[PDB]
Amino acid sequence: DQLVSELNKIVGVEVSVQDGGTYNLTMANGYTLVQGSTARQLAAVPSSAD
């Protein structure tokens, strides 16, 4: 609980009780940032238009 709340204080990460009782994290449209026992990963970039 504490670490998910900590992460939340940078970017919007939502949490949902998954049917099996697991703790799923999701981001801002449905990007399941943590689905089950797996996390997605992210990137930094220079903008496509500038």
Partner: peptide, 8 residues
């Protein structure tokens, strides 16, 4: 509210 998050 375009809502979905689930995996069953």
């Amino acid at each position: 509210a375009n809502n979905i998050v689930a995996t069953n």
